[PDB]
Symmetry: D2
């Protein structure tokens, strides 16, 4: 599993459950091409987005649908979504985790790149 996403909620102190996540890859013409998608689990995690075969080097965008998340909780949020854009490079380690911590007016994100 080369690409995982984990999302936490800083207001409730819990995983962010049932958040839609869409991943895109940058195409040669500079447009965003759909690549993978899913909803986070009870543990705030999304696995099995892709295989090693399909996950080639390039620029990827992970879009997290935070607006729908907050509204479903009755909270008015600031952002239209949260977007994480990065380069996958074969020289570095091969397993990528994109982790995000959400609040209504703020978010933080880090990368954990292993083995």
């Amino acid at each position: 599993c080369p690409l995982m996403v984990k999302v936490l909620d800083a207001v409730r102190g819990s995983p962010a459950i049932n958040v839609a996540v869409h991943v895109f890859r940058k195409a040669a013409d500079d447009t965003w091409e759909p690549f993978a998608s899913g909803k986070t689990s009870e543990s705030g995690e999304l696995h099995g987005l892709t295989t090693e075969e399909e996950f080639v080097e390039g620029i990827y965008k992970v879009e997290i649908d935070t607006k729908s998340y907050w509204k479903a909780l009755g909270s008015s949020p600031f952002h239209e979504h949260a977007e994480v854009v990065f380069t996958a490079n074969d020289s570095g380690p091969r397993r990528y985790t994109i982790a995000a911590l959400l609040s209504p007016y703020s978010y933080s994100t880090t990368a954990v790149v292993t083995n």
Copy 2:
């Protein structure tokens, strides 16, 4: 000044100086139109992006050019940039500050919104 950006550097314990910032506004046709740009000062602050008159209601994208910042420091970072996308001024004019904290493999951003 209705739209400001302030950026700090978590590795140096200092303001993030000379960070390029580009702002876009979603157009009636649904693509990103260039709206304003600038770079942070020695205090890590960017003022004078726009005016009250020109900063009308819309969906704005503030793109903080984190990769160019780290690369100019000779460091290889993870992200291409940090984007903050939000609806602005839909309840009348407000003043917005986007505050950010940068590390090579992480960033945090928050918004400070003032005014009736």
Copy 3:
């Protein structure tokens, strides 16, 4: 002003106002001695904690009273407080800003250090 604190609120998208801050200094006997205290203003900023003369070399603890802040807003938070502990002025006088971002179950803090 050689020691300042600035605090933002991630839930309201605003400065964190009326946050109590207590600073302690480790004493020759190795316990925490009270050093200074204050509360943040409407801009989320706390100035005037100490003076250049009194802010000598040592190990300082800046305790940001996050629980009292959230409880005064009628919210039940997780942490008792946020502590930032650091050696100061060991290479001569510097100016320090401790910047923090608060949510009910999370906080972030960073330091900005200026001067030769």
Copy 4:
């Protein structure tokens, strides 16, 4: 496992490995009483600190030895350590994860409290 700690490194984009962590419980006289300790694993995680039996309600402090961590990497850090102080309450969910993201002049921490 009622109490877990997970530590990440924002400079390298990796787990924070082999970081000493000491947990204390507040005693009736307001002093900090040693409770549990360990070093984070290859995945930045520390498990098996305590049992449900010993983990009673009260105030706890999780001290992370970040200074030693950064110095072992050749980096001069700002903090003497990172401390996370919180109340364990039986009314809320029963599994606590304390997560921390480290940089030399900064750290962030959140709580993930589940089932």
